[PDB]
Design a protein around this ligand. Structure first.
Ligand SMILES: CO[C@H]1O[C@H](CO)[C@@H](O)[C@H](O)[C@H]1O
Ligand SMILES: [Ca+2]
Lengths: 706, 702
């Protein structure tokens, strides 16, 4: 059942290293490639920068005619001579801390104003930020493709060349994110108007959903400014839906152009979202790719992991991100397109002894392939560095090809991977818990994010109290998922959109973190889940509204629930745990009918119940908790034990993390110490104990035959 | 010349541990105190919560009549029996994750609406947030003081009781910081109007400074909402000055009440500002106490240090805070009133091996005393915790007085401190670099902060491009100060306000991080400094405006500077360093008559010059850099070397931090490894290995 890369009909662990030929003395390219191969890597990865190769308009150099490091053709031939497969990434954007994010200086000087991303006042957001579907931008992008794509096509694996994969552009939308200023370019606003007319057909239908009074579609403007009315929320919701279709149109245009050159290799894209060493916003960015992933089964998305350090402060980010990619892309392996090696920022250190633990933790956490980014340091030639002359620090090789401390860490990890990959790639973890991923709670990058300038969404002005970003960051990502990982309970994540009921029936529990709104399809799905025999844990709210904040009481009615919303102390009791601190004064107070009351407010009013419905079980908690106290871990533990779920190991130190991965042949036990303490502990299988000592911020791996 | 606590006429390192009697079973009070003493700690510290002792209106229990943990008198007696001095903190606010931040529930139910802090519409901001100068709030505070202060008075050291210091209230102004909201209670606004009338005298004078069109003071409304006009910036600037006076009025009323009971012990206050393990906002909180510090030489402010971890990610925060407090409070020792021990937050781990290294780094960085907060965990009685049942985790003792991992680390550090205190407390570092602290750049807690989600200050709307918070956080705190500490160059900080020219002449360089605005007094000070023989480094702007954004070009004119502001690539070259990334497209381009050009834009326009002015030297850079590349460290190193300043040691590993502390007889070398790497190195003016996130201290006789 596992998804993994295959080479010659056998499991293959993809081990790539990033080596920027354009930032390395070409007399040293062969030494970099040999030293990468000698770590057991099978692949090398590089950007092909448009700025570097189209040196002036219609003046192309791929042969080193004008600068030796423009000799892409020679770099491709060296990869083949040194038995490395090649990933190529020709943009048009590369970012890569390259001046203008990779776009030619001559291009950005020549483009007219209507090629750029524009704010609502019509001003350029950034002199290096184009509008993706600008006619002018795509014409010049196509002329760049006309020159680089025949080279890529010629050198594909099917023609005995080394090229196995190509990335389209780079982290689509990472700029509408890192300004939260969204693109109000008129090509964009016109496509949005077409989208709305296609979605609603008549202004009367749009007015019935939004509760607006427009006389025609000509009166409807792109939403801007703060959300003050439920009608503003509806307009922005559709504007988020529109941006997902817009990014799908962009990548669709690039893909159709590439395929016309006879390029049949695997196409990729890369997911941004780590900043300052955690990834709690990454799920919002992956949600922007929802329409690409539905329409392009042949484009594999990989993660850009930037942990910066490896401790309890960020231990849950990589696992929650790996699980959420698997939920949105269940038919392809989970892989890291960019897998931190060294640091992009001199002042933000990357220690070999941290990253080595991150690499092993990533294996425990189900990664199936990765591209060390950056394996080799670079030096920017010709002033091309966005932020300074040196590209990356504390890498595996310096720019001169000297081995640095990280080289032996990568060789060690790669050696274990090559020894074990045949069994390790086929291992699963036994997850008895499924956590639901409700994508619409994530569709807020225009109105609510850690990066956005202006907070545009204030749910209280809409008569709501549960903010979808607060729910998905603090109750779900930093709360439930952090809590389950800390307690060593395995979970899977499932996308609730078009979700097959038969996928959900394998789990002992389904956990749904709900706001006051949820679409009829999902309310119906969860109703059927419980009636047919499922066990559902649902908090902090029974929803009563749909995605447009119109009445939808399907789940409430199907579960026989009556409630009133009342103010009380933040503290509740639940399952006999006193002084559980909850996020809101407002709580759902349930009437006790045909139920067991299991949580109480300070006034002893019922704010949680358990009941039997058809063949299934329902636990509802009308209050919000993440993981900000010890009472929160005790509560998660109690809820898991309601269905007699057990950890795989008894471990004497509750602060040790572990993962058991197994197939029919092999069992791997991964122990992870995310803490600055040398820990001595003992363990045994849940169905004579072994003693282990583990260093600070370190790991152990045990293999068992059978 | 050093400032330090004294005991028996000798230097004394103040070692206190926080132990909340009201959160510990009283059968275990003695065991907690004995275990604290056995670490070498000399003092114990606690709040005395108003809510806990005035159990109903005018019903006081200090003797455990109604709950055994209300026996304050017994706890004071145990402190004396167990040979510990005591710091008491009776509020009225204690915060301390205590319900209602320590105020009685019966008081908050009874107060009239006009006793509360109000929003601009007259709505109560929070049911536990009083107006500091409310007559009804102060009447009830005075009735609390009338019961608790005679007990404190009787138990002073003077009367062979254990009480040696007392804190007034707790983190005054903290609620306005966390919310970004000011108190618009009409009594506060009337005091603001009196402040403005006092400052300007006539509506004509205020109109001339603000460019307003008022016919009288009656037209004048307290500022609110986003700053759109230069006149709104002016009004908000004086609103910040007003709150600094308002906090001084409040602490003065408490102080005078306390002194009326014959309480002659040392009075204290505490400074917050750490967020997620860094402290780049704490200087803004120091700045809120400017008027208290000028008017109360006898109130010692201590720091609340909350590092959470110990690495290169936050290594610079505690030194920069200790140096700024020394600048603002030169006649008292720098001490930590709340010195992290364990963690307030279960999910935010506090490792003994991190905190041990933080404690030794704090000695390197000039700390003279501290109070481990929390030495002892607590259990909230009777649901009185703001949060869950437990108060703090990973402390030295759990609430039951079980020893935890931190206990042995604190005992080890305290043993070293007691062994070395007589000499270590009398050591200083030799700073040849002085960095200017310009308080008006910090006066922004109501309009621009890390906690204020919706920014009210947008300098581009005012025709400015250098934001004072960006400057003070990224160019100063996380840039210059981080860079100097990383490069192992000693610096001192100086308060530029009413600054003595004679004090600046000890230094070989003065570094000024300047926005486009600077008051006439500071422009004149820097003018006189250079003309008299000083070496000034000034960036990223020669200022041309005063604090009210009215023309003021004293420094520009006295230095013969001309410039045009022009847009160019972010990257410049400086002192032959190529590809120096700068924060702004806009840069100052200088006329170079009588000057030497030393920095260039991508098109070779002059964005930095050196010049001789009178007996002194000027280096002006018309661009902003912090520390976000290796070129930035190269540029700081070149600037320091312009005046032949040298590090004290050659250390073979540049990523080892050191501090040399000296007096006439004794030298201490502190080696700090802020990295996850075992490092081996040698040093000279001898080959040593230091574990990850660890330290080594070397003694040299001179
Ligand atoms: C500009 O984008 C870069 O920085 C952001 C913010 O850290 C990352 O999320 C992203 O993966 C990286 O490519
Ligand atoms: Ca001149």
């Amino acid at each position: 059942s596992e998804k993994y890369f295959v080479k010659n009909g056998q499991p293959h662990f993809l081990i790539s290293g990033e080596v920027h030929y354009f930032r390395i003395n070409p007399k040293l390219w062969r030494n970099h490639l040999q030293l990468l191969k000698q770590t057991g890597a099978d692949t090398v990865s590089t950007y092909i920068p448009w700025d570097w190769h189209e040196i002036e308009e219609d003046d192309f150099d791929f042969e080193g005619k004008t600068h030796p490091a423009r000799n892409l053709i020679r770099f491709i031939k060296l990869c083949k001579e040194e038995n490395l497969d090649l990933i190529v990434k020709p943009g048009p954007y590369i970012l890569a801390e390259y001046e203008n994010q990779g776009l030619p200086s001559w291009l950005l000087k020549k483009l007219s104003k209507n090629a750029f991303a524009l704010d609502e006042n019509g001003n350029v957001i950034s002199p290096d930020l184009v509008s993706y579907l600008s006619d002018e931008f795509l014409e010049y992008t196509f002329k760049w493709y006309d020159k680089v794509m025949p080279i890529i096509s010629k050198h594909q694996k099917e023609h005995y060349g080394p090229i196995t994969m190509m990335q389209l552009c780079n982290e689509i939308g990472v700029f509408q994110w890192l300004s939260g200023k969204s693109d109000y370019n008129p090509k964009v606003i016109n496509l949005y108007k077409e989208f709305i007319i296609q979605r609603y057909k008549t202004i009367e239908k749009l007015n019935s959903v939004y509760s607006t009074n427009y006389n025609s579609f000509d009166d409807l403007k792109a939403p801007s400014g703060k959300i003050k009315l439920r009608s503003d929320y509806c307009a922005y919701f559709d504007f988020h839906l529109f941006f997902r279709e817009y990014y799908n149109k962009y990548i669709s245009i690039l893909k159709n152009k590439i395929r016309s050159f006879g390029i049949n290799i695997k196409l990729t894209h890369n997911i941004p979202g780590w900043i300052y060493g955690n990834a709690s916003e990454l799920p919002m960015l992956i949600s922007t790719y929802s329409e690409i992933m539905k329409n392009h089964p042949d484009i594999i998305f990989g993660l850009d992991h930037i942990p910066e350090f490896v401790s309890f402060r960020n231990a849950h980010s990589d696992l929650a991100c790996n699980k959420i990619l698997e939920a949105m892309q269940p038919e392809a392996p989970v892989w890291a397109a960019e897998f931190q090696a060294g640091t992009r920022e001199h002042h933000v250190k990357a220690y070999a002894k941290d990253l080595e633990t991150f690499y092993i933790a990533s294996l425990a956490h189900g990664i199936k392939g990765f591209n060390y980014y950056m394996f080799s340091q670079g030096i920017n030639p010709e002033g091309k560095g966005f932020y300074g002359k040196t590209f990356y620090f504390q890498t595996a090789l310096d720019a001169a090809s000297n081995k640095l401390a990280l080289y032996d860490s990568i060789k060690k990890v790669n050696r274990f991977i090559r020894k074990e990959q045949k069994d390790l790639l086929r291992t699963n973890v036994n997850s008895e818990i499924c956590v639901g991923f409700y994508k619409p709670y994530f569709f807020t990058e225009l109105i609510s994010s850690q990066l956005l300038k202006e907070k545009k969404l204030n749910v209280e002005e809409l008569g709501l109290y549960i903010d979808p970003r607060f729910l998905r960051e603090e109750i779900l990502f930093n709360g439930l998922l952090r809590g389950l990982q800390t307690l060593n309970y395995n979970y899977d994540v499932v996308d609730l959109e078009n979700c097959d009921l038969k996928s959900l029936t394998a789990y002992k529990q389904l956990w749904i973190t709900s706001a006051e709104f949820m679409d009829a399809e999902t309310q119906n799905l969860l109703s059927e889940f419980v009636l047919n025999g499922g066990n559902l844990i649902l908090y902090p709210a029974v929803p009563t509204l749909d995605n447009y904040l119109n009445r939808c009481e399907i789940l409430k009615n199907n579960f026989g629930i009556e409630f009133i919303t009342k103010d009380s102390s933040h503290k509740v009791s639940a399952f006999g745990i006193e002084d559980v601190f909850t996020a809101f004064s407002k709580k759902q107070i349930y009437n006790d009918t045909n139920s067991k009351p299991i949580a109480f407010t300070q006034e002893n009013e019922i704010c949680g119940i358990r009941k039997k419905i058809g063949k299934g079980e329902l636990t509802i908690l009308g209050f919000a908790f993440g993981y900000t106290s010890d009472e929160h871990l005790e509560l998660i533990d109690k809820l898991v034990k309601l269905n007699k779920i057990k950890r795989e190991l008894f471990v004497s130190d509750k602060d040790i993390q572990f993962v058991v991965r197994e197939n029919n042949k092999s069992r791997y036990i991964f122990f992870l110490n995310y803490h600055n303490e040398r820990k001595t502990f003992n363990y045994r299988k849940s169905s004579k104990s072994e003693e282990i000592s583990i260093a600070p911020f370190s790991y152990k791996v045990i293999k068992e035959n059978k």
